[PDB]
Curated annotation (Swiss-Prot), chain A:
Protein name stated in the entry: HAUS augmin-like complex subunit 7
Tissue: Detected in spleen, thymus, testis, ovary, small intestine and colon, with highest levels of expression in testis and ovary.
Disulfide bonds: none
Protein's cellular compartments: Cytoplasm, Cytoskeleton, Microtubule organizing center, Centrosome; Cytoplasm, Cytoskeleton, Spindle
Quaternary assembly: Component of the HAUS augmin-like complex. The complex interacts with the gamma-tubulin ring complex and this interaction is required for spindle assembly. Interacts with UCHL5. Interacts with EML3 (phosphorylated at 'Thr-881').
Organism: Homo sapiens (Human)
Role of this protein: Contributes to mitotic spindle assembly, maintenance of centrosome integrity and completion of cytokinesis as part of the HAUS augmin-like complex.
Sequence similarity: Belongs to the HAUS7 family.
Swiss-Prot record, chain B:
Full-protein positions shown: 241 to 336 of 955
Upper classification of the organism: Eukaryota, Metazoa, Chordata, Craniata, Vertebrata
The protein's name: HAUS augmin-like complex subunit 6
Similarity comment: family membership: Belongs to the HAUS6 family.
Function description: Contributes to mitotic spindle assembly, maintenance of centrosome integrity and completion of cytokinesis as part of the HAUS augmin-like complex. Promotes the nucleation of microtubules from the spindle through recruitment of NEDD1 and gamma-tubulin.
Subcellular locations according to the entry: Cytoplasm, Cytoskeleton; Cytoplasm, Cytoskeleton, Spindle; Cytoplasm, Cytoskeleton, Microtubule organizing center, Centrosome
Domain of life: Eukaryota
Species for this entry: Homo sapiens (Human)
PTM info: Phosphorylated during mitosis.
Curated annotation (Swiss-Prot), chain C:
Protein's cellular compartments: Cytoplasm, Cytoskeleton, Microtubule organizing center, Centrosome; Cytoplasm, Cytoskeleton, Spindle
Purpose of the protein: Contributes to mitotic spindle assembly, maintenance of centrosome integrity and completion of cytokinesis as part of the HAUS augmin-like complex.
Entry similarity comment: Belongs to the HAUS2 family.
Sections of the chain in a coiled coil: 1-50
Subunit structure: Component of the HAUS augmin-like complex. The complex interacts with the gamma-tubulin ring complex and this interaction is required for spindle assembly. Interacts with EML3 (phosphorylated at 'Thr-881').
Top-level taxon of origin: Eukaryota
Protein name in the entry: HAUS augmin-like complex subunit 2
Secretion signal, residue range per the UniProt entry: none
Curated annotation (Swiss-Prot), chain D:
Protein name per the record: HAUS augmin-like complex subunit 8
Residues of the full protein shown: 206 to 308 of 410
Family affiliation: Belongs to the HAUS8 family.
Subunit composition and interactions: Component of the HAUS augmin-like complex. The complex interacts with the gamma-tubulin ring complex and this interaction is required for spindle assembly. Associates with microtubules. The interaction with microtubules is strong during mitosis, while it is weak or absent during interphase. It is unclear whether this interaction is direct or indirect. Interacts with EML3 (phosphorylated at 'Thr-881') and TUBG1.
Localization, UniProt: Cytoplasm; Cytoplasm, Cytoskeleton, Microtubule organizing center, Centrosome; Cytoplasm, Cytoskeleton, Spindle; Cytoplasm, Cytoskeleton, Spindle pole
Summary of the function given for this chain in its UniProt record: Contributes to mitotic spindle assembly, maintenance of centrosome integrity and completion of cytokinesis as part of the HAUS augmin-like complex.
Length: 105, 96, 114, 103
């Protein structure tokens, strides 16, 4: 752990000095413009992407409840459709024979 | 060390907000076909004076303004159709 | 042993390898995050060369997932409007429908009872 | 003797960072402000260009303000319990088929 921490802090100081020199030659130099893409233009963006995300989950909400309604209609058709068919004509008369055997008691 | 940590992490968080999933793009959309319900054609044949909706494809390319107009009219028609309905509240029990 | 354990527990904040291990893992977390930042320096300076250009609007790649998803949701709307229209018109959403399934589940229940 | 040794060791581990830390945190604060600005100044609402790009942007903004007022009048529902009830109704359709065969 001692060797690991000294190597990690060595590479971390290397990353620190790299970040300093990158900021001093390219990043802060890009930020060195007197008009640095002026910050009042910043809050103007808080109507596009946050609204886009809001519309995103609102569409998933509306399609989700639409699929819920479609499955509701499908289940209505299944419940009211009388899915049992009593096996046509032979099975219903055979079942009738079971009830005549059942009321033999 | 603790001080510096408390003084950076939130900023690191929003860096993790921006440098995340930076490799996303769109795909081909020409494979999408059109089967328009004819009631939409009826509605666009009813109110030419008020509805300034252009073609979906002009010069062989998609027009976003016209299709957002079409979805806006679809949503408005849905709004009329649901405000004709008297229902207000929805409640369901999944525990049952 | 009372004194030795006392001096061992009094130095628990910095000496023992436990807290050294957690601060090490925080260091690799910081290093991995900042390395992921630093590897794309050309992409970052591509972002830095994008001011308020109204003539040439600078779109990015993070927002592409949102626009792809909303476009696909619009396509799925346009594909099957008719099913949604017939679904809303015939019966109310989870209202009369909700009621009839509770009364008609009892018929399968009692059918199992016979 | 051993406590002084380990203390001395963490002194040379800790000492060089403290001088550079102040400049590092100040320049990190400035560059994070710049990152906040450039994230706050990327307007993305456009397609293949019709008219002008900014005109297309503003037309989409107005259309989505209309869409947002229609949504704010009509914001009802959820998304995950719908998935759960769809899954359970599909499972009970399967159970209905198997119980018919079993019957």
């Amino acid at each position: 752990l001692d060797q690991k921490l000294r190597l990690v802090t060595s590479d971390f100081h290397q990353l620190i000095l790299a970040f300093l020199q990158v900021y001093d030659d390219e990043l802060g130099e890009c930020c060195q413009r007197p008009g640095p893409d002026l910050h009042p233009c910043g809050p103007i963006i808080q109507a596009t992407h946050q609204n886009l995300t809001s519309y995103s989950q609102l569409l998933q909400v509306v399609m989700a409840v639409a699929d819920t309604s479609a499955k509701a209609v499908e289940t209505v058709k299944k419940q009211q459709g009388e899915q049992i068919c009593w096996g046509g004509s032979s099975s219903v008369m055979s079942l009738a024979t079971k009830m005549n055997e059942l009321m033999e008691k | 060390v603790n001080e510096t940590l408390m003084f950076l992490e939130k900023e690191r968080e929003v860096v993790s907000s921006v440098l995340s999933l930076v490799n996303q793009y769109a795909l081909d959309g020409t494979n999408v076909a059109i089967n328009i319900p004819r009631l939409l054609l009826d509605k666009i044949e009813k109110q030419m004076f008020q509805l300034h909706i252009g073609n979906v494809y002009e010069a062989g390319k998609l027009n976003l303004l016209t299709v957002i107009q079409l979805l806006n009219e679809v949503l408005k028609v849905m709004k009329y159709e649901r405000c004709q309905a008297d229902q207000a509240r929805l409640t369901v029990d999944l525990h049952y | 042993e009372i004194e030795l354990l006392k001096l061992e527990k009094d130095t628990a904040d910095v000496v023992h390898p436990f807290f050294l291990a957690q601060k090490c893992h925080t260091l690799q977390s910081m290093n991995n995050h900042l390395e992921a930042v630093l590897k794309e320096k050309r992409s970052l300076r591509q972002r830095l060369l994008k001011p308020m250009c109204q003539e040439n609007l600078p779109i990015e790649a993070v927002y592409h997932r949102y626009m792809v998803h909303l476009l696909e949701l619009a396509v799925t709307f346009i594909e099957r409007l008719e099913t949604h229209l017939e679904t809303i018109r015939n019966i109310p959403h989870l209202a009369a429908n909700l009621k009839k399934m509770n009364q008609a589940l009892a018929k399968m229940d009692i059918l199992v009872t016979e | 003797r051993e406590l002084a040794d380990v203390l001395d060791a963490q002194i040379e581990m800790l000492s060089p960072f403290e001088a550079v830390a102040t400049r590092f945190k100040e320049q990190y604060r400035t560059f994070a402000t710049a990152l906040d600005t450039t994230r706050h100044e990327l307007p993305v609402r456009s397609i293949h260009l019709e008219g002008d790009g900014q005109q297309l942007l503003d037309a989409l903004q107005h259309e989505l303000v209309t869409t947002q007022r229609l949504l704010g009048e009509l914001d009802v529902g959820d998304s995950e319990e719908n998935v759960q009830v769809l899954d359970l109704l599909s499972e009970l359709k399967d159970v209905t088929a198997k119980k018919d065969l079993e019957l």
